[PDB]
Short mmCIF file of C-alpha atoms in Angstrom, two decimals:
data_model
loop_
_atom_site.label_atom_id
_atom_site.label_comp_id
_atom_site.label_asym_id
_atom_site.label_seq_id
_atom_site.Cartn_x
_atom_site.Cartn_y
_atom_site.Cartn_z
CA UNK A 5 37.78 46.61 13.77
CA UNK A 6 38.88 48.01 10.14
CA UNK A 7 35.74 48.90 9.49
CA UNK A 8 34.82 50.46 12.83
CA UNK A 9 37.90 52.49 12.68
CA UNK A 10 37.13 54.54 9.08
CA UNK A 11 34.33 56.09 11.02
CA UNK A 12 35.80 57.25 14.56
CA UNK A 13 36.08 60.69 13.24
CA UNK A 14 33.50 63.24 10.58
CA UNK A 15 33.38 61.29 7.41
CA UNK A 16 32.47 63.41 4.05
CA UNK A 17 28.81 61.97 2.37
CA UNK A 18 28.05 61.49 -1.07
CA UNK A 19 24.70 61.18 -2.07
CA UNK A 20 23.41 60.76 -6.03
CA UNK A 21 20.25 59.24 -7.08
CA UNK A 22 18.66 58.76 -10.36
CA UNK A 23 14.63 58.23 -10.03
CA UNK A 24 11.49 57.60 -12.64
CA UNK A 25 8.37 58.12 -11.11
CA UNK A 26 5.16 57.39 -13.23
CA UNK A 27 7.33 58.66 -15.96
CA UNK A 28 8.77 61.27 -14.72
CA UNK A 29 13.01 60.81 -14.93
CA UNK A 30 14.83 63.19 -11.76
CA UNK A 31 18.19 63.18 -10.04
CA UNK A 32 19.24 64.36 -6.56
CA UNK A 33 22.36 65.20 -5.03
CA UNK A 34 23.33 65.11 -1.98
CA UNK A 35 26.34 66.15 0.00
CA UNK A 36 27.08 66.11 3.94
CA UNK A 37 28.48 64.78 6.62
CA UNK A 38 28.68 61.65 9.19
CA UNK A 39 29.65 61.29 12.82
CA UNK A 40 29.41 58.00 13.48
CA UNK A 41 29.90 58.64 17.40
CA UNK A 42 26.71 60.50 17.92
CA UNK A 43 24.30 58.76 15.32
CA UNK A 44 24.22 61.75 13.40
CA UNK A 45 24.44 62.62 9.77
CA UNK A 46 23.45 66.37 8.11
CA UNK A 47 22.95 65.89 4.27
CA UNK A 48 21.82 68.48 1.81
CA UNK A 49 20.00 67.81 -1.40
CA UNK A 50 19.09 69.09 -4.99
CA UNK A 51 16.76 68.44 -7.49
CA UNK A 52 19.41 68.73 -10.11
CA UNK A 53 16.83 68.18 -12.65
CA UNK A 54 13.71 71.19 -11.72
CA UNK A 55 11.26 70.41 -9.16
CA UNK A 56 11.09 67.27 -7.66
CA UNK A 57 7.70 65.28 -8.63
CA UNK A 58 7.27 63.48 -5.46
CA UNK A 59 7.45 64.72 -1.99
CA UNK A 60 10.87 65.27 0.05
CA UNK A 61 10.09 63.52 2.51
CA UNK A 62 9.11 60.54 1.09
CA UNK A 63 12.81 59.95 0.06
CA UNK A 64 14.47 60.01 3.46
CA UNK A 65 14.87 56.52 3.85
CA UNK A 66 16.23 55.96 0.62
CA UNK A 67 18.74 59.08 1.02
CA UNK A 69 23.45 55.20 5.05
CA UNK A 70 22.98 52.77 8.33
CA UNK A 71 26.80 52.83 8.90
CA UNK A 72 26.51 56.04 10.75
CA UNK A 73 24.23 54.66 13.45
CA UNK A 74 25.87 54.61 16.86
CA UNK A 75 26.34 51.15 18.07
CA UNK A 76 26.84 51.69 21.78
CA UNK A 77 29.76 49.31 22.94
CA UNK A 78 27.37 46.61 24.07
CA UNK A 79 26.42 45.96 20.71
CA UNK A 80 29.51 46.81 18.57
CA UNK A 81 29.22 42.93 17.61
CA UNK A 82 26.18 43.33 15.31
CA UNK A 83 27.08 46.88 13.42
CA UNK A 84 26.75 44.88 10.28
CA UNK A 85 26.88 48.22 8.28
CA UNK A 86 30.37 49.20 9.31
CA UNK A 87 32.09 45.62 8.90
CA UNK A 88 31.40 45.39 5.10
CA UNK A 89 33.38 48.75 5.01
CA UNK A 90 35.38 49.98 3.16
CA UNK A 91 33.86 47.84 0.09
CA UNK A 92 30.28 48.82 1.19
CA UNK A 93 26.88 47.31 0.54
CA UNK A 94 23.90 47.17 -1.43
CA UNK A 95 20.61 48.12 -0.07
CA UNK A 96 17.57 47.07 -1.82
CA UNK A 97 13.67 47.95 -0.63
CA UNK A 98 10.32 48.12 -1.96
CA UNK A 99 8.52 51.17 -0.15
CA UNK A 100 4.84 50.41 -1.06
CA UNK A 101 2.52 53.74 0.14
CA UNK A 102 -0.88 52.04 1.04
CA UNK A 103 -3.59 52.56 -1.12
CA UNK A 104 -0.59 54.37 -3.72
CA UNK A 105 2.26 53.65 -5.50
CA UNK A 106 5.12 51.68 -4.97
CA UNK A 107 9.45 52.42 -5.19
CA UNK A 108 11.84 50.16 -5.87
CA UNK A 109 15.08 51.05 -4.84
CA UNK A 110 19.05 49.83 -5.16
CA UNK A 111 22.04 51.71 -3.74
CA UNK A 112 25.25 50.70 -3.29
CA UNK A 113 26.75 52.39 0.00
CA UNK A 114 30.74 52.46 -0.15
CA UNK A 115 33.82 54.37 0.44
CA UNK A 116 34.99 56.28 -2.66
CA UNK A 117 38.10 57.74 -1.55
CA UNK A 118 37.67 59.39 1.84
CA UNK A 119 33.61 59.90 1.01
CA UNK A 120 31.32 57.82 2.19
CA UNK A 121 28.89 57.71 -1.63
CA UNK A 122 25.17 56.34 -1.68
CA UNK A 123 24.06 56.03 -4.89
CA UNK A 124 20.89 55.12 -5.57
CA UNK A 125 18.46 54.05 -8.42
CA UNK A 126 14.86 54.75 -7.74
CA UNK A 127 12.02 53.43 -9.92
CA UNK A 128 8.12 54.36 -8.85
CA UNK A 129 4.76 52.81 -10.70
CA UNK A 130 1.80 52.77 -9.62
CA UNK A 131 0.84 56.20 -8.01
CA UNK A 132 -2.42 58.11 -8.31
CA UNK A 133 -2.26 61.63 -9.63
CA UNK A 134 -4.19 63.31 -7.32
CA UNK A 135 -3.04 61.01 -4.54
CA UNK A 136 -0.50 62.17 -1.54
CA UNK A 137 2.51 61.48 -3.20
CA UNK A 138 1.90 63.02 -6.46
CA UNK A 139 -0.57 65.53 -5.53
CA UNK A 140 2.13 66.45 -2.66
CA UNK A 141 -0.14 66.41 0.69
CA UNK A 142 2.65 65.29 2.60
CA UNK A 143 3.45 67.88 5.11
CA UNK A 144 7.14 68.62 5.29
CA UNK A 145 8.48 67.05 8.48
CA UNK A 146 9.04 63.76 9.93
CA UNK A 147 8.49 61.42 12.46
CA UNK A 148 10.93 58.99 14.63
CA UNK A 149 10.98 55.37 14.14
CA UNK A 150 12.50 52.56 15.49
CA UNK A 151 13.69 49.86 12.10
CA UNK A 152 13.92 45.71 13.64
CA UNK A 153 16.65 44.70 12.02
CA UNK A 154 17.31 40.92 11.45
CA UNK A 155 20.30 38.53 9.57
CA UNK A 156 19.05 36.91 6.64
CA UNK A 157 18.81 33.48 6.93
CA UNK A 158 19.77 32.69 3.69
CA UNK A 159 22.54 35.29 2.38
CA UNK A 160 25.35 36.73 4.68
CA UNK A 161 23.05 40.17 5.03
CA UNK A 162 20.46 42.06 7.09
CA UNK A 163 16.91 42.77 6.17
CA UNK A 164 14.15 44.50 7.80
CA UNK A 165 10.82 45.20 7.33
CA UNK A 166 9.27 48.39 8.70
CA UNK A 167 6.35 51.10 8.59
CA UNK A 168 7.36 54.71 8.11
CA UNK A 169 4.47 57.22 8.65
CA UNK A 170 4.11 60.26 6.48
CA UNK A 171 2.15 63.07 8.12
CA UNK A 172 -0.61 64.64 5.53
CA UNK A 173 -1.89 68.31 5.51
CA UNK A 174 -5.34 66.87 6.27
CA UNK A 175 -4.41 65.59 9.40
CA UNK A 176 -4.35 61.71 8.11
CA UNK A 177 -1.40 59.83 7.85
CA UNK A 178 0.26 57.77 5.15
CA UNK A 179 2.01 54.65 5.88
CA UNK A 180 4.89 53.59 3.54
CA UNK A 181 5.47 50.03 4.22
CA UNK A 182 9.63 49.23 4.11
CA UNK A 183 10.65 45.74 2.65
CA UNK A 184 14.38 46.45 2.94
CA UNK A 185 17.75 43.64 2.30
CA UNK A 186 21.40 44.64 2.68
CA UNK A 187 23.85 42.52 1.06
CA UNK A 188 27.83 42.97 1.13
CA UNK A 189 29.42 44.21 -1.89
CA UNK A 190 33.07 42.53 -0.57
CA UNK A 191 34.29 38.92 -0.23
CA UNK A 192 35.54 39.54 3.51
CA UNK A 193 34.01 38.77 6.85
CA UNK A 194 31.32 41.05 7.85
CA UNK A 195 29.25 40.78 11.11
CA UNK A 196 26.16 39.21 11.50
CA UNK A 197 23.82 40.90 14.40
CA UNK A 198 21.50 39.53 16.30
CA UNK A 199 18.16 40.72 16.15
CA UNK A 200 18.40 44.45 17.19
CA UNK A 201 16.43 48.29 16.68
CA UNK A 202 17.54 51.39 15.18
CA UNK A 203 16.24 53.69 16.64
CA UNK A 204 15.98 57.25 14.29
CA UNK A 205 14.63 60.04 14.39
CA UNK A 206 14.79 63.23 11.68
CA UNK A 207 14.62 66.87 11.39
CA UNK A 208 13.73 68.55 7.88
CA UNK A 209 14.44 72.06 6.47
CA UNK A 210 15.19 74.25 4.23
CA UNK A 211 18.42 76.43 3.26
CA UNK A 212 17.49 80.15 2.82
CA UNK A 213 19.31 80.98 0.32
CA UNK A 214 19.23 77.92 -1.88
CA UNK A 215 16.98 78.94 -5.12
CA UNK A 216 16.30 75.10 -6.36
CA UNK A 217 14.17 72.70 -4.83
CA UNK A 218 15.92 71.23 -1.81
CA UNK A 219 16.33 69.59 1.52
CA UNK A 220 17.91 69.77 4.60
CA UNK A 221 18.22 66.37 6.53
CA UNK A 222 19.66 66.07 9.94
CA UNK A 223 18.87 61.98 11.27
CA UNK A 224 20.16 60.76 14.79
CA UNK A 225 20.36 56.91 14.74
CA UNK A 226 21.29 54.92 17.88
CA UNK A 227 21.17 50.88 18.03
CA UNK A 228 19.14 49.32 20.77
CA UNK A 229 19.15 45.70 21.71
CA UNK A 230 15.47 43.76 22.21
#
Protein backbone atom coordinates (compact mmCIF):
# COMPACT_ATOMS: atom_id res chain seq x y z
CA UNK A 1 0.00 0.00 0.00
CA UNK A 2 1.88 3.34 1.28
CA UNK A 3 4.46 1.52 2.35
CA UNK A 4 4.84 -0.82 -0.62
CA UNK A 5 4.81 2.09 -2.88
CA UNK A 6 8.15 4.13 -1.32
CA UNK A 7 10.06 1.17 -2.61
CA UNK A 8 8.80 0.45 -6.34
CA UNK A 9 11.77 2.24 -7.62
CA UNK A 10 16.08 2.44 -6.36
CA UNK A 11 15.89 3.79 -2.90
CA UNK A 12 19.27 5.60 -1.51
CA UNK A 13 20.76 3.46 1.89
CA UNK A 14 22.12 4.82 4.88
CA UNK A 15 24.03 2.78 6.99
CA UNK A 16 25.92 4.07 10.50
CA UNK A 17 26.84 1.92 13.32
CA UNK A 18 28.58 2.56 16.49
CA UNK A 19 30.17 -0.85 18.07
CA UNK A 20 32.35 -1.84 21.43
CA UNK A 21 33.80 -5.03 21.17
CA UNK A 22 35.76 -6.40 24.28
CA UNK A 23 36.63 -2.81 24.63
CA UNK A 24 37.37 -1.84 21.63
CA UNK A 25 34.87 1.43 20.52
CA UNK A 26 34.49 1.48 16.17
CA UNK A 27 32.05 3.02 13.74
CA UNK A 28 31.05 2.01 10.19
CA UNK A 29 29.46 3.69 7.47
CA UNK A 30 27.70 2.59 5.03
CA UNK A 31 26.14 3.95 1.90
CA UNK A 32 24.20 2.15 -1.11
CA UNK A 33 21.42 1.31 -2.70
CA UNK A 34 17.96 -0.79 -2.65
CA UNK A 35 15.77 -2.30 -5.34
CA UNK A 36 13.15 -3.64 -3.70
CA UNK A 37 11.87 -5.46 -7.03
CA UNK A 38 14.76 -7.79 -7.37
CA UNK A 39 15.71 -8.49 -3.60
CA UNK A 40 18.76 -6.71 -4.04
CA UNK A 41 20.69 -4.17 -2.11
CA UNK A 42 24.70 -3.08 -2.87
CA UNK A 43 26.09 -1.27 0.30
CA UNK A 44 29.58 -0.07 0.86
CA UNK A 45 31.27 0.30 4.19
CA UNK A 46 34.11 2.04 6.26
CA UNK A 47 35.81 1.61 9.25
CA UNK A 48 35.64 5.27 9.95
CA UNK A 49 37.56 4.69 13.02
CA UNK A 50 41.13 2.43 11.67
CA UNK A 51 40.84 -1.16 11.24
CA UNK A 52 37.97 -2.92 12.16
CA UNK A 53 38.63 -5.39 15.30
CA UNK A 54 36.26 -8.03 14.33
CA UNK A 55 35.77 -9.69 11.07
CA UNK A 56 33.60 -8.16 8.05
CA UNK A 57 31.74 -10.63 7.68
CA UNK A 58 30.55 -11.21 10.86
CA UNK A 59 28.55 -7.90 10.59
CA UNK A 60 26.41 -8.65 7.56
CA UNK A 61 23.40 -9.37 9.27
CA UNK A 62 23.50 -6.52 11.38
CA UNK A 63 24.39 -4.12 8.28
CA UNK A 64 17.42 -3.81 6.10
CA UNK A 65 14.56 -6.69 5.46
CA UNK A 66 12.38 -4.09 3.62
CA UNK A 67 14.24 -4.68 0.47
CA UNK A 68 13.37 -8.36 0.25
CA UNK A 69 11.15 -9.16 -2.72
CA UNK A 70 7.81 -10.32 -1.62
CA UNK A 71 6.53 -12.03 -4.74
CA UNK A 72 2.74 -11.03 -5.17
CA UNK A 73 1.51 -14.15 -3.43
CA UNK A 74 2.82 -13.02 -0.33
CA UNK A 75 2.66 -9.18 -0.48
CA UNK A 76 0.24 -9.71 2.68
CA UNK A 77 3.04 -10.58 5.15
CA UNK A 78 5.98 -7.94 3.98
CA UNK A 79 5.84 -6.77 7.53
CA UNK A 80 9.08 -4.71 6.85
CA UNK A 81 7.58 -2.42 4.25
CA UNK A 82 4.13 -1.68 6.10
CA UNK A 83 5.78 0.02 9.16
CA UNK A 84 7.32 2.36 6.45
CA UNK A 85 7.90 5.29 6.26
CA UNK A 86 8.27 5.47 10.28
CA UNK A 87 10.47 2.28 10.22
CA UNK A 88 11.37 -0.28 12.84
CA UNK A 89 13.59 -1.42 15.39
CA UNK A 90 15.53 -4.54 15.06
CA UNK A 91 17.00 -6.07 18.04
CA UNK A 92 19.27 -9.57 18.09
CA UNK A 93 21.68 -11.31 20.15
CA UNK A 94 24.23 -13.08 17.67
CA UNK A 95 25.94 -15.53 20.12
CA UNK A 96 29.23 -17.27 18.09
CA UNK A 97 29.39 -20.80 19.73
CA UNK A 98 32.04 -21.47 21.92
CA UNK A 99 32.83 -17.19 21.55
CA UNK A 100 31.48 -14.10 22.20
CA UNK A 101 28.27 -12.68 21.98
CA UNK A 102 26.63 -9.06 20.10
CA UNK A 103 23.92 -7.33 21.09
CA UNK A 104 22.49 -5.26 18.64
CA UNK A 105 19.60 -2.30 18.16
CA UNK A 106 18.90 -0.42 14.92
CA UNK A 107 16.27 1.53 14.05
CA UNK A 108 15.50 1.11 10.16
CA UNK A 109 13.51 4.27 8.76
CA UNK A 110 13.10 6.72 6.06
CA UNK A 111 15.12 9.91 6.64
CA UNK A 112 14.17 11.97 3.83
CA UNK A 113 14.34 9.99 0.61
CA UNK A 114 17.18 7.49 2.35
CA UNK A 115 16.36 4.54 3.64
CA UNK A 116 19.03 4.94 7.27
CA UNK A 117 19.97 1.81 9.50
CA UNK A 118 21.55 2.80 12.35
CA UNK A 119 22.80 0.57 14.55
CA UNK A 120 24.37 0.17 18.09
CA UNK A 121 26.53 -2.84 18.50
CA UNK A 122 27.87 -4.02 21.87
CA UNK A 123 30.22 -7.44 21.97
CA UNK A 124 31.53 -9.27 25.45
CA UNK A 125 32.64 -12.20 25.80
CA UNK A 126 35.12 -13.11 22.93
CA UNK A 127 38.41 -14.99 23.16
CA UNK A 128 41.49 -13.28 21.88
CA UNK A 129 42.89 -15.76 19.93
CA UNK A 130 39.47 -17.06 18.96
CA UNK A 131 37.85 -16.64 15.22
CA UNK A 132 36.39 -13.50 15.70
CA UNK A 133 39.14 -11.66 17.28
CA UNK A 134 41.98 -13.54 15.99
CA UNK A 135 40.15 -12.97 12.43
CA UNK A 136 40.02 -16.73 10.93
CA UNK A 137 36.97 -15.99 9.25
CA UNK A 138 37.53 -16.28 5.61
CA UNK A 139 36.09 -13.39 3.69
CA UNK A 140 32.96 -14.63 1.92
CA UNK A 141 29.61 -15.82 2.71
CA UNK A 142 27.16 -18.30 2.57
CA UNK A 143 23.20 -18.28 1.63
CA UNK A 144 20.62 -18.78 4.17
CA UNK A 145 17.16 -19.06 4.38
CA UNK A 146 15.80 -16.74 7.98
CA UNK A 147 11.95 -18.44 9.35
CA UNK A 148 10.36 -15.61 10.11
CA UNK A 149 7.37 -15.63 12.57
CA UNK A 150 4.71 -12.75 14.27
CA UNK A 151 5.27 -12.33 17.77
CA UNK A 152 2.68 -13.47 19.75
CA UNK A 153 2.83 -10.98 22.16
CA UNK A 154 3.85 -7.47 20.48
CA UNK A 155 2.56 -6.36 16.95
CA UNK A 156 6.25 -7.54 15.45
CA UNK A 157 8.25 -10.33 13.79
CA UNK A 158 11.01 -12.34 15.30
CA UNK A 159 13.16 -15.04 14.11
CA UNK A 160 15.62 -17.16 15.23
CA UNK A 161 18.32 -18.43 12.88
CA UNK A 162 21.96 -19.99 12.37
CA UNK A 163 24.35 -18.10 10.13
CA UNK A 164 27.57 -20.06 9.27
CA UNK A 165 30.89 -18.35 9.07
CA UNK A 166 33.42 -20.19 6.92
CA UNK A 167 37.06 -20.39 8.78
CA UNK A 168 40.53 -20.52 7.02
CA UNK A 169 40.96 -23.95 8.63
CA UNK A 170 38.30 -25.41 6.87
CA UNK A 171 35.82 -25.47 10.13
CA UNK A 172 32.94 -23.49 10.38
CA UNK A 173 31.54 -21.07 12.93
CA UNK A 174 27.98 -20.88 13.69
CA UNK A 175 26.56 -17.52 14.92
CA UNK A 176 23.30 -18.29 16.42
CA UNK A 177 20.54 -15.22 15.46
CA UNK A 178 17.92 -14.37 18.24
CA UNK A 179 16.39 -11.51 16.25
CA UNK A 180 12.73 -9.18 17.18
CA UNK A 181 11.41 -6.38 14.97
CA UNK A 182 9.13 -4.02 16.50
CA UNK A 183 7.36 -0.90 14.73
CA UNK A 184 8.62 2.41 15.51
CA UNK A 185 4.92 4.04 14.28
CA UNK A 186 1.41 3.94 15.80
CA UNK A 187 -0.23 2.80 12.34
CA UNK A 188 -1.29 -0.55 11.02
CA UNK A 189 1.47 -2.68 9.91
CA UNK A 190 1.11 -6.30 8.54
CA UNK A 191 1.39 -9.26 10.36
CA UNK A 192 2.79 -12.40 8.14
CA UNK A 193 2.24 -15.63 8.49
CA UNK A 194 4.96 -17.83 9.09
CA UNK A 195 7.26 -17.42 5.99
CA UNK A 196 11.40 -17.74 4.73
CA UNK A 197 13.74 -15.28 3.48
CA UNK A 198 15.61 -16.62 1.52
CA UNK A 199 19.36 -14.60 1.09
CA UNK A 200 22.13 -15.05 -0.19
CA UNK A 201 25.51 -12.58 -0.30
CA UNK A 202 28.47 -11.70 -2.25
CA UNK A 203 31.57 -9.90 -0.49
CA UNK A 204 34.39 -7.70 -1.91
CA UNK A 205 36.52 -5.28 -1.94
CA UNK A 206 36.84 -1.72 -3.78
CA UNK A 207 40.32 -1.32 -5.41
CA UNK A 208 40.95 1.76 -4.82
CA UNK A 209 39.53 2.32 -1.37
CA UNK A 210 42.73 2.76 1.10
CA UNK A 211 40.66 2.11 4.56
CA UNK A 212 39.37 -1.00 5.73
CA UNK A 213 36.17 -1.80 3.87
CA UNK A 214 33.43 -3.86 2.38
CA UNK A 215 31.55 -4.45 -0.46
CA UNK A 216 28.07 -6.14 0.15
CA UNK A 217 25.76 -7.15 -2.59
CA UNK A 218 22.57 -9.49 -0.73
CA UNK A 219 19.62 -10.89 -2.93
CA UNK A 220 16.61 -11.58 -0.62
CA UNK A 221 13.40 -13.22 -1.95
CA UNK A 222 10.35 -14.32 0.46
CA UNK A 223 9.18 -17.88 0.23
CA UNK A 224 6.07 -19.26 1.78
CA UNK A 225 6.35 -22.83 3.96
Amino acid sequence: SKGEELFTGVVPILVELDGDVNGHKFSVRGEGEGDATNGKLTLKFICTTGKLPVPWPTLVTTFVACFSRYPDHMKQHDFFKSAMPEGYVQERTISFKDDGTYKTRAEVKFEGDTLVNRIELKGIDFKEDGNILGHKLEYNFNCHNVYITADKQKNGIKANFKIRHNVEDGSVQLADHYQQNTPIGDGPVLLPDNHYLSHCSALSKDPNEKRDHMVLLEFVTAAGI
